[PDB]
Amino acid sequence: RPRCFFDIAINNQPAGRVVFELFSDVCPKTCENFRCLCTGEKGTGKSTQKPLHYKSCLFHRVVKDFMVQGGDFSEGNGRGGESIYGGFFEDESFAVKHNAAFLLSMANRGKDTNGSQFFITTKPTPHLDGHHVVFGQVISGQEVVREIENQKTDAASKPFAEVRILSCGELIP
C-alpha cells in the first residue's frame, strides 16, 4: 500500500505533517491519481494547463464536525481541479465505509466526476457512502487535521487563515 504526505502551514506557519495510507488494493485507479498528485510526477493538467500537483494547494473548505476539503489546485475554491487521466474518472469502489474520522475520500460534482479534489472526514459520515469513494486513511497527523477542522471560516466555509500544503509527496519505504 502507498504512503503519501502533506506538510501543512496555517497562515504560513508550519502546523505539521499529515501521512496517509492508500488502499491501492481496493481502489487502485483512485489511489494512483492521489499518489501522483502528491508527487506531481504526471506533469501538466490537460484541461487546466496547470501542474497536477498538490504543492501550494489549499484546504479551501472546512466544516467542523464533518470534514476538511482541498485539492483544487487550479482555482483554490472548489471550481477547479482535474485528475491525472485528463478530466474526471469513474467511481471505482464503495467498499470502504465512511464510518470514522480521518478517512480520505474523493470530493466530486455528482456521479463519476472524480478529479483532484479530496476530503478528510472528521466524524462518521455514513450518508456519504455510495456518493464518494473512500480510498485511504490518515496514519499520522490526526492533530493537524483537528487544527484545520477548527479554522474560522467565511460564508463559503473557506478558512480565513490560509491552510496550505507547503510540501507533499510519497514516502518510499
Short mmCIF file of N, CA and C in Angstrom, two decimals:
data_model
loop_
_atom_site.label_atom_id
_atom_site.label_comp_id
_atom_site.label_asym_id
_atom_site.label_seq_id
_atom_site.Cartn_x
_atom_site.Cartn_y
_atom_site.Cartn_z
N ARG A 1 0.84 -1.24 0.00
CA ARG A 1 0.00 0.00 0.00
C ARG A 1 0.86 1.28 0.00
N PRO A 2 0.59 2.20 -0.92
CA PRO A 2 1.32 3.50 -0.93
C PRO A 2 1.11 4.37 0.32
N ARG A 3 2.17 5.05 0.77
CA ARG A 3 2.05 6.15 1.73
C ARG A 3 2.44 7.51 1.18
N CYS A 4 1.57 8.49 1.39
CA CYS A 4 1.78 9.87 0.97
C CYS A 4 1.74 10.84 2.13
N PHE A 5 2.29 12.03 1.91
CA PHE A 5 2.35 13.03 2.95
C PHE A 5 1.96 14.42 2.43
N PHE A 6 1.38 15.18 3.37
CA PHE A 6 1.22 16.65 3.32
C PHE A 6 1.98 17.29 4.51
N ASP A 7 2.77 18.31 4.23
CA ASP A 7 3.28 19.25 5.24
C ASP A 7 2.40 20.49 5.14
N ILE A 8 1.63 20.72 6.20
CA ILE A 8 0.66 21.78 6.30
C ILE A 8 1.17 23.05 7.01
N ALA A 9 0.97 24.19 6.36
CA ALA A 9 1.09 25.50 7.01
C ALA A 9 -0.26 26.20 7.18
N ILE A 10 -0.37 26.96 8.25
CA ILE A 10 -1.59 27.75 8.52
C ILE A 10 -1.16 29.21 8.68
N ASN A 11 -1.57 30.03 7.71
CA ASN A 11 -1.09 31.38 7.56
C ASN A 11 0.44 31.40 7.60
N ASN A 12 1.00 30.46 6.84
CA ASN A 12 2.42 30.37 6.58
C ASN A 12 3.30 29.85 7.72
N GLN A 13 2.65 29.43 8.81
CA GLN A 13 3.31 28.81 9.94
C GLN A 13 3.12 27.27 9.89
N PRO A 14 4.21 26.51 9.91
CA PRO A 14 4.07 25.04 9.89
C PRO A 14 3.19 24.51 11.04
N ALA A 15 2.16 23.73 10.69
CA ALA A 15 1.29 23.04 11.66
C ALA A 15 1.72 21.60 11.86
N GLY A 16 2.47 21.08 10.89
CA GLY A 16 2.98 19.71 10.91
C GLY A 16 2.54 18.88 9.70
N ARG A 17 2.92 17.60 9.73
CA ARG A 17 2.74 16.64 8.65
C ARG A 17 1.57 15.66 8.86
N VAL A 18 0.76 15.54 7.82
CA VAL A 18 -0.25 14.50 7.72
C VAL A 18 0.23 13.39 6.74
N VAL A 19 0.23 12.15 7.22
CA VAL A 19 0.63 10.98 6.44
C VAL A 19 -0.60 10.11 6.21
N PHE A 20 -0.80 9.71 4.95
CA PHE A 20 -1.91 8.84 4.52
C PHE A 20 -1.41 7.48 4.03
N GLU A 21 -2.21 6.46 4.29
CA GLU A 21 -2.04 5.17 3.67
C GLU A 21 -3.13 5.10 2.60
N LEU A 22 -2.74 4.65 1.42
CA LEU A 22 -3.67 4.50 0.31
C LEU A 22 -4.07 3.03 0.07
N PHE A 23 -5.39 2.80 0.00
CA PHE A 23 -5.99 1.45 -0.13
C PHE A 23 -5.91 1.00 -1.60
N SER A 24 -4.69 0.88 -2.11
CA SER A 24 -4.48 0.59 -3.52
C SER A 24 -4.99 -0.80 -3.89
N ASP A 25 -5.13 -1.68 -2.89
CA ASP A 25 -5.75 -3.00 -3.11
C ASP A 25 -7.27 -2.89 -3.32
N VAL A 26 -7.86 -1.74 -2.99
CA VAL A 26 -9.32 -1.56 -3.05
C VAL A 26 -9.76 -0.69 -4.23
N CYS A 27 -9.04 0.41 -4.45
CA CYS A 27 -9.34 1.40 -5.50
C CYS A 27 -8.05 1.84 -6.17
N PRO A 28 -7.40 0.97 -6.92
CA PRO A 28 -6.08 1.32 -7.42
C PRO A 28 -6.01 2.57 -8.30
N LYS A 29 -7.04 2.84 -9.11
CA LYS A 29 -7.01 3.95 -10.06
C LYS A 29 -7.11 5.29 -9.30
N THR A 30 -8.01 5.31 -8.30
CA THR A 30 -8.19 6.42 -7.37
C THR A 30 -6.91 6.73 -6.57
N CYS A 31 -6.28 5.67 -6.08
CA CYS A 31 -5.04 5.77 -5.33
C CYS A 31 -3.91 6.29 -6.21
N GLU A 32 -3.85 5.83 -7.46
CA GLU A 32 -2.73 6.25 -8.35
C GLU A 32 -2.79 7.73 -8.65
N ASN A 33 -4.02 8.23 -8.85
CA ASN A 33 -4.28 9.62 -9.08
C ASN A 33 -3.74 10.47 -7.91
N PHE A 34 -4.20 10.16 -6.70
CA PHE A 34 -3.81 10.87 -5.48
C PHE A 34 -2.30 10.76 -5.27
N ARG A 35 -1.76 9.57 -5.44
CA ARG A 35 -0.32 9.39 -5.33
C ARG A 35 0.43 10.39 -6.22
N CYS A 36 0.07 10.43 -7.50
CA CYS A 36 0.77 11.22 -8.50
C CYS A 36 0.57 12.72 -8.31
N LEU A 37 -0.60 13.10 -7.80
CA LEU A 37 -0.86 14.50 -7.44
C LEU A 37 0.04 14.97 -6.28
N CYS A 38 0.45 14.02 -5.43
CA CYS A 38 1.31 14.33 -4.28
C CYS A 38 2.76 14.49 -4.73
N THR A 39 3.15 13.66 -5.69
CA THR A 39 4.50 13.73 -6.23
C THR A 39 4.63 14.77 -7.33
N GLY A 40 3.52 15.05 -8.03
CA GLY A 40 3.50 15.92 -9.20
C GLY A 40 4.09 15.28 -10.46
N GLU A 41 4.27 13.96 -10.45
CA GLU A 41 5.06 13.26 -11.50
C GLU A 41 4.43 13.20 -12.91
N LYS A 42 3.12 13.39 -12.99
CA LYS A 42 2.39 13.34 -14.27
C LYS A 42 2.38 14.71 -15.02
N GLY A 43 2.95 15.74 -14.42
CA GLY A 43 3.14 17.00 -15.12
C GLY A 43 1.93 17.92 -15.20
N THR A 44 1.52 18.28 -16.42
CA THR A 44 0.53 19.35 -16.62
C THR A 44 -0.88 18.83 -16.84
N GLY A 45 -1.83 19.45 -16.15
CA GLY A 45 -3.24 19.10 -16.27
C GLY A 45 -3.67 19.33 -17.71
N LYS A 46 -4.52 18.45 -18.21
CA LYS A 46 -4.85 18.51 -19.62
C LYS A 46 -5.81 19.65 -19.93
N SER A 47 -6.92 19.77 -19.20
CA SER A 47 -7.87 20.86 -19.38
C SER A 47 -7.42 22.13 -18.65
N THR A 48 -6.79 21.95 -17.49
CA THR A 48 -6.46 23.04 -16.58
C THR A 48 -5.21 23.79 -17.04
N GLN A 49 -4.28 23.07 -17.67
CA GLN A 49 -2.97 23.59 -18.07
C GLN A 49 -2.14 24.08 -16.85
N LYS A 50 -2.32 23.38 -15.74
CA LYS A 50 -1.61 23.66 -14.51
C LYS A 50 -1.10 22.35 -13.95
N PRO A 51 -0.01 22.44 -13.14
CA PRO A 51 0.60 21.24 -12.61
C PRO A 51 -0.42 20.37 -11.90
N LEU A 52 -0.35 19.08 -12.21
CA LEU A 52 -1.07 18.05 -11.49
C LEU A 52 -0.31 17.79 -10.18
N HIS A 53 -0.44 18.70 -9.22
CA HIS A 53 0.40 18.71 -8.01
C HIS A 53 -0.34 19.46 -6.90
N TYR A 54 -0.37 18.84 -5.72
CA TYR A 54 -0.96 19.43 -4.54
C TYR A 54 -0.04 20.48 -3.89
N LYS A 55 1.23 20.53 -4.25
CA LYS A 55 2.12 21.53 -3.64
C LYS A 55 1.52 22.94 -3.84
N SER A 56 1.46 23.70 -2.74
CA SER A 56 0.83 25.03 -2.65
C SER A 56 -0.72 25.06 -2.74
N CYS A 57 -1.35 23.88 -2.80
CA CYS A 57 -2.81 23.77 -2.78
C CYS A 57 -3.39 24.09 -1.40
N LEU A 58 -4.65 24.55 -1.40
CA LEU A 58 -5.36 24.94 -0.21
C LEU A 58 -6.38 23.88 0.21
N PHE A 59 -6.59 23.74 1.51
CA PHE A 59 -7.83 23.20 2.07
C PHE A 59 -8.81 24.37 1.99
N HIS A 60 -9.55 24.43 0.89
CA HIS A 60 -10.49 25.55 0.61
C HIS A 60 -11.85 25.40 1.28
N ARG A 61 -12.12 24.25 1.91
CA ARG A 61 -13.42 24.12 2.60
C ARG A 61 -13.24 23.29 3.88
N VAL A 62 -13.85 23.79 4.96
CA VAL A 62 -13.74 23.23 6.30
C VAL A 62 -15.10 23.32 6.99
N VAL A 63 -15.59 22.19 7.46
CA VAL A 63 -16.88 22.13 8.16
C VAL A 63 -16.70 21.33 9.48
N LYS A 64 -16.63 22.06 10.59
CA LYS A 64 -16.42 21.47 11.91
C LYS A 64 -17.44 20.37 12.14
N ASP A 65 -16.97 19.25 12.68
CA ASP A 65 -17.77 18.04 12.92
C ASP A 65 -18.18 17.31 11.64
N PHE A 66 -17.51 17.60 10.52
CA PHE A 66 -17.86 16.91 9.27
C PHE A 66 -16.63 16.49 8.47
N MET A 67 -15.92 17.46 7.89
CA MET A 67 -14.75 17.15 7.06
C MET A 67 -13.93 18.41 6.69
N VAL A 68 -12.75 18.18 6.15
CA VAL A 68 -11.91 19.25 5.57
C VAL A 68 -11.58 18.83 4.13
N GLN A 69 -11.76 19.78 3.22
CA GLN A 69 -11.66 19.53 1.80
C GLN A 69 -10.60 20.40 1.14
N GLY A 70 -9.80 19.80 0.26
CA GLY A 70 -8.81 20.52 -0.53
C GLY A 70 -8.56 19.81 -1.84
N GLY A 71 -7.45 20.15 -2.48
CA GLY A 71 -7.06 19.54 -3.76
C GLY A 71 -7.43 20.32 -5.02
N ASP A 72 -8.07 21.49 -4.89
CA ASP A 72 -8.43 22.30 -6.07
C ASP A 72 -7.22 23.12 -6.47
N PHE A 73 -6.38 22.53 -7.29
CA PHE A 73 -5.05 23.13 -7.49
C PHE A 73 -5.09 24.27 -8.48
N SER A 74 -6.14 24.33 -9.28
CA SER A 74 -6.19 25.31 -10.38
C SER A 74 -7.02 26.57 -10.03
N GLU A 75 -7.97 26.44 -9.10
CA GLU A 75 -8.81 27.58 -8.69
C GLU A 75 -8.77 27.88 -7.19
N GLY A 76 -8.47 26.88 -6.36
CA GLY A 76 -8.39 27.10 -4.91
C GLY A 76 -9.71 27.35 -4.23
N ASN A 77 -10.81 26.94 -4.83
CA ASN A 77 -12.12 27.30 -4.28
C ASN A 77 -13.26 26.29 -4.50
N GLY A 78 -12.94 25.10 -5.03
CA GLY A 78 -13.94 24.09 -5.36
C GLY A 78 -14.32 23.99 -6.84
N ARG A 79 -14.11 25.06 -7.61
CA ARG A 79 -14.46 25.08 -9.05
C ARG A 79 -13.51 24.31 -9.99
N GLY A 80 -12.30 24.04 -9.53
CA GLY A 80 -11.20 23.67 -10.43
C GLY A 80 -10.76 22.28 -10.16
N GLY A 81 -9.56 21.96 -10.61
CA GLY A 81 -9.04 20.61 -10.41
C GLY A 81 -9.35 19.66 -11.55
N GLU A 82 -8.54 18.62 -11.62
CA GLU A 82 -8.55 17.68 -12.72
C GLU A 82 -7.73 16.46 -12.27
N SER A 83 -8.13 15.28 -12.74
CA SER A 83 -7.44 14.03 -12.43
C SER A 83 -6.21 13.91 -13.33
N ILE A 84 -5.32 12.98 -12.99
CA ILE A 84 -4.12 12.69 -13.79
C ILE A 84 -4.43 12.07 -15.18
N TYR A 85 -5.68 11.65 -15.40
CA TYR A 85 -6.06 10.93 -16.60
C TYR A 85 -6.62 11.86 -17.70
N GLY A 86 -6.68 13.17 -17.43
CA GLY A 86 -7.48 14.11 -18.26
C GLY A 86 -8.93 14.10 -17.80
N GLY A 87 -9.41 15.25 -17.34
CA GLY A 87 -10.75 15.40 -16.80
C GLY A 87 -11.00 14.57 -15.56
N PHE A 88 -12.22 14.02 -15.47
CA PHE A 88 -12.61 13.20 -14.34
C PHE A 88 -12.60 11.71 -14.63
N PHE A 89 -12.64 10.91 -13.57
CA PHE A 89 -12.79 9.47 -13.73
C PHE A 89 -13.95 8.86 -12.91
N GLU A 90 -14.20 7.59 -13.21
CA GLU A 90 -15.37 6.87 -12.69
C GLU A 90 -15.19 6.54 -11.22
N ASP A 91 -16.31 6.55 -10.48
CA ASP A 91 -16.36 6.00 -9.14
C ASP A 91 -15.95 4.52 -9.22
N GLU A 92 -14.87 4.16 -8.51
CA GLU A 92 -14.29 2.83 -8.66
C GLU A 92 -14.77 1.78 -7.58
N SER A 93 -15.06 2.24 -6.35
CA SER A 93 -15.41 1.37 -5.22
C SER A 93 -16.22 2.11 -4.17
N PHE A 94 -17.31 1.48 -3.71
CA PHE A 94 -17.99 1.93 -2.49
C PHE A 94 -17.77 0.95 -1.30
N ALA A 95 -16.74 0.12 -1.40
CA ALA A 95 -16.46 -0.96 -0.42
C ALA A 95 -16.08 -0.44 0.98
N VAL A 96 -15.33 0.67 1.05
CA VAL A 96 -14.85 1.21 2.31
C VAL A 96 -15.89 2.22 2.78
N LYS A 97 -16.35 2.05 4.01
CA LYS A 97 -17.46 2.85 4.53
C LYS A 97 -16.92 4.14 5.15
N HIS A 98 -17.71 5.21 5.09
CA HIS A 98 -17.44 6.47 5.79
C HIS A 98 -17.83 6.40 7.28
N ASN A 99 -17.19 5.51 8.01
CA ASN A 99 -17.64 5.17 9.35
C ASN A 99 -16.79 5.75 10.50
N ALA A 100 -15.75 6.52 10.18
CA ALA A 100 -14.86 7.09 11.17
C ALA A 100 -14.35 8.47 10.70
N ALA A 101 -13.77 9.24 11.62
CA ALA A 101 -12.88 10.33 11.27
C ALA A 101 -11.62 9.79 10.60
N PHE A 102 -10.98 10.68 9.85
CA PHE A 102 -9.63 10.52 9.36
C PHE A 102 -9.56 9.58 8.17
N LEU A 103 -10.72 9.33 7.56
CA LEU A 103 -10.83 8.67 6.26
C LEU A 103 -10.66 9.68 5.10
N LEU A 104 -9.85 9.27 4.12
CA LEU A 104 -9.60 10.02 2.88
C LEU A 104 -10.50 9.58 1.73
N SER A 105 -11.27 10.54 1.19
CA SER A 105 -12.29 10.25 0.23
C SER A 105 -12.38 11.33 -0.87
N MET A 106 -12.94 10.95 -2.01
CA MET A 106 -12.97 11.84 -3.16
C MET A 106 -14.17 12.76 -3.04
N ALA A 107 -13.91 14.06 -3.10
CA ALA A 107 -14.95 15.04 -3.32
C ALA A 107 -15.33 14.93 -4.79
N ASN A 108 -16.57 15.26 -5.13
CA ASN A 108 -16.98 15.27 -6.55
C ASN A 108 -18.12 16.23 -6.84
N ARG A 109 -18.55 16.27 -8.10
CA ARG A 109 -19.69 17.09 -8.53
C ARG A 109 -20.85 16.19 -9.00
N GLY A 110 -21.07 15.07 -8.30
CA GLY A 110 -22.02 14.02 -8.66
C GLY A 110 -21.34 12.75 -9.19
N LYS A 111 -22.16 11.84 -9.74
CA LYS A 111 -21.69 10.54 -10.26
C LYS A 111 -20.55 10.68 -11.28
N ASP A 112 -19.47 9.92 -11.06
CA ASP A 112 -18.34 9.75 -12.00
C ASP A 112 -17.66 11.08 -12.41
N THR A 113 -17.47 11.95 -11.42
CA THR A 113 -16.81 13.25 -11.59
C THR A 113 -15.57 13.37 -10.62
N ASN A 114 -14.85 12.27 -10.40
CA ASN A 114 -13.58 12.28 -9.63
C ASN A 114 -12.45 13.03 -10.37
N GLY A 115 -11.89 14.04 -9.71
CA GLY A 115 -10.86 14.90 -10.27
C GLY A 115 -9.55 14.88 -9.49
N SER A 116 -9.20 16.01 -8.86
CA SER A 116 -8.07 16.08 -7.90
C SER A 116 -8.57 16.37 -6.48
N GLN A 117 -9.84 16.73 -6.32
CA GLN A 117 -10.31 17.14 -5.03
C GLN A 117 -10.67 15.99 -4.08
N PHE A 118 -10.28 16.18 -2.82
CA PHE A 118 -10.40 15.17 -1.76
C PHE A 118 -10.89 15.80 -0.47
N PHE A 119 -11.42 14.95 0.41
CA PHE A 119 -11.74 15.38 1.74
C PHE A 119 -11.33 14.33 2.83
N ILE A 120 -11.04 14.83 4.03
CA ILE A 120 -10.66 14.02 5.16
C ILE A 120 -11.83 14.15 6.10
N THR A 121 -12.55 13.06 6.32
CA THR A 121 -13.67 13.07 7.30
C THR A 121 -13.18 13.46 8.69
N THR A 122 -14.02 14.12 9.50
CA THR A 122 -13.70 14.39 10.92
C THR A 122 -14.67 13.81 11.96
N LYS A 123 -15.70 13.14 11.47
CA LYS A 123 -16.62 12.27 12.25
C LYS A 123 -17.07 11.14 11.32
N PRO A 124 -17.84 10.17 11.85
CA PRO A 124 -18.51 9.24 10.95
C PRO A 124 -19.51 9.99 10.08
N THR A 125 -19.43 9.77 8.78
CA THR A 125 -20.29 10.40 7.78
C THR A 125 -20.89 9.33 6.87
N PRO A 126 -21.77 8.47 7.43
CA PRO A 126 -22.22 7.31 6.65
C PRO A 126 -23.11 7.71 5.49
N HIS A 127 -23.69 8.91 5.54
CA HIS A 127 -24.54 9.33 4.43
C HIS A 127 -23.73 9.56 3.12
N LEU A 128 -22.40 9.64 3.21
CA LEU A 128 -21.60 9.80 2.01
C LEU A 128 -21.31 8.48 1.31
N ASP A 129 -21.65 7.36 1.93
CA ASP A 129 -21.43 6.05 1.29
C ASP A 129 -22.26 5.96 -0.04
N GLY A 130 -21.63 5.46 -1.10
CA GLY A 130 -22.20 5.37 -2.44
C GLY A 130 -22.13 6.65 -3.24
N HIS A 131 -21.74 7.73 -2.60
CA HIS A 131 -21.65 9.02 -3.31
C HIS A 131 -20.21 9.47 -3.46
N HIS A 132 -19.36 9.05 -2.52
CA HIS A 132 -17.94 9.37 -2.56
C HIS A 132 -17.11 8.12 -2.29
N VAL A 133 -16.01 8.00 -3.03
CA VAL A 133 -15.14 6.86 -2.97
C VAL A 133 -14.08 7.07 -1.89
N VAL A 134 -14.22 6.31 -0.80
CA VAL A 134 -13.16 6.20 0.24
C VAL A 134 -11.97 5.40 -0.34
N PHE A 135 -10.77 6.02 -0.36
CA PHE A 135 -9.58 5.39 -0.92
C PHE A 135 -8.33 5.37 0.00
N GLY A 136 -8.43 5.95 1.19
CA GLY A 136 -7.32 6.00 2.12
C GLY A 136 -7.69 6.44 3.53
N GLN A 137 -6.66 6.67 4.33
CA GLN A 137 -6.79 6.91 5.76
C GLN A 137 -5.56 7.65 6.27
N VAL A 138 -5.79 8.61 7.17
CA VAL A 138 -4.70 9.21 7.94
C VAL A 138 -4.01 8.20 8.89
N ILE A 139 -2.68 8.07 8.78
CA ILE A 139 -1.92 7.23 9.75
C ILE A 139 -1.14 8.04 10.82
N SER A 140 -0.76 9.26 10.49
CA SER A 140 -0.26 10.20 11.48
C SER A 140 -0.62 11.63 11.05
N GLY A 141 -0.61 12.52 12.04
CA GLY A 141 -1.01 13.92 11.88
C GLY A 141 -2.49 14.16 12.13
N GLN A 142 -3.11 13.30 12.92
CA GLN A 142 -4.52 13.49 13.26
C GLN A 142 -4.78 14.88 13.92
N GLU A 143 -3.88 15.26 14.82
CA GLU A 143 -3.93 16.57 15.50
C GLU A 143 -3.82 17.78 14.54
N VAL A 144 -3.08 17.60 13.45
CA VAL A 144 -3.04 18.63 12.40
C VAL A 144 -4.42 18.77 11.68
N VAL A 145 -5.04 17.63 11.35
CA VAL A 145 -6.39 17.58 10.79
C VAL A 145 -7.39 18.33 11.72
N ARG A 146 -7.35 18.04 13.03
CA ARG A 146 -8.19 18.77 14.01
C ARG A 146 -7.92 20.28 13.98
N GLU A 147 -6.66 20.64 13.86
CA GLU A 147 -6.28 22.04 13.81
C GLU A 147 -6.92 22.74 12.58
N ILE A 148 -6.95 22.04 11.46
CA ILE A 148 -7.56 22.53 10.21
C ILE A 148 -9.08 22.61 10.39
N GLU A 149 -9.67 21.54 10.90
CA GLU A 149 -11.10 21.49 11.20
C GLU A 149 -11.61 22.66 12.05
N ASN A 150 -10.74 23.15 12.92
CA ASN A 150 -11.08 24.22 13.86
C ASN A 150 -10.83 25.65 13.31
N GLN A 151 -10.50 25.76 12.03
CA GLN A 151 -10.24 27.10 11.46
C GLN A 151 -11.57 27.85 11.44
N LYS A 152 -11.54 29.14 11.78
CA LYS A 152 -12.69 30.01 11.47
C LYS A 152 -12.80 30.19 9.95
N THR A 153 -14.02 30.06 9.45
CA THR A 153 -14.29 30.14 8.03
C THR A 153 -15.19 31.33 7.66
N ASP A 154 -15.21 31.62 6.36
CA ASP A 154 -16.01 32.67 5.75
C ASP A 154 -17.36 32.11 5.31
N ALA A 155 -18.11 32.86 4.50
CA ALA A 155 -19.50 32.48 4.20
C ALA A 155 -19.56 31.24 3.30
N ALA A 156 -18.49 30.96 2.56
CA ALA A 156 -18.41 29.73 1.78
C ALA A 156 -17.67 28.59 2.51
N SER A 157 -17.42 28.71 3.81
CA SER A 157 -16.68 27.68 4.62
C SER A 157 -15.20 27.55 4.23
N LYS A 158 -14.66 28.63 3.66
CA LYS A 158 -13.26 28.76 3.32
C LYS A 158 -12.57 29.42 4.50
N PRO A 159 -11.50 28.79 4.99
CA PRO A 159 -10.79 29.36 6.14
C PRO A 159 -10.31 30.80 5.90
N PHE A 160 -10.49 31.64 6.92
CA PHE A 160 -9.89 32.99 6.89
C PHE A 160 -8.38 32.88 6.85
N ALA A 161 -7.82 31.90 7.56
CA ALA A 161 -6.37 31.69 7.53
C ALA A 161 -6.05 30.75 6.39
N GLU A 162 -5.01 31.06 5.62
CA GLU A 162 -4.60 30.18 4.53
C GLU A 162 -4.14 28.82 5.13
N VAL A 163 -4.79 27.71 4.74
CA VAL A 163 -4.40 26.34 5.11
C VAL A 163 -3.83 25.69 3.83
N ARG A 164 -2.51 25.62 3.75
CA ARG A 164 -1.80 25.34 2.53
C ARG A 164 -0.89 24.13 2.67
N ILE A 165 -0.89 23.30 1.63
CA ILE A 165 0.07 22.21 1.51
C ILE A 165 1.41 22.84 1.01
N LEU A 166 2.38 22.98 1.91
CA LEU A 166 3.68 23.62 1.60
C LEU A 166 4.62 22.65 0.90
N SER A 167 4.55 21.39 1.30
CA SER A 167 5.24 20.30 0.65
C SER A 167 4.34 19.08 0.68
N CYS A 168 4.61 18.18 -0.25
CA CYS A 168 3.90 16.88 -0.34
C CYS A 168 4.75 15.89 -1.10
N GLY A 169 4.41 14.61 -0.97
CA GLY A 169 4.97 13.56 -1.82
C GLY A 169 4.62 12.19 -1.32
N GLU A 170 5.43 11.23 -1.72
CA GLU A 170 5.25 9.84 -1.38
C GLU A 170 6.40 9.41 -0.50
N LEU A 171 6.06 8.68 0.55
CA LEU A 171 7.03 8.06 1.43
C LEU A 171 7.47 6.74 0.79
N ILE A 172 8.69 6.71 0.24
CA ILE A 172 9.22 5.47 -0.38
C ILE A 172 9.83 4.58 0.73
N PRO A 173 9.27 3.38 0.92
CA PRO A 173 9.72 2.63 2.10
C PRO A 173 11.14 2.08 1.90
#
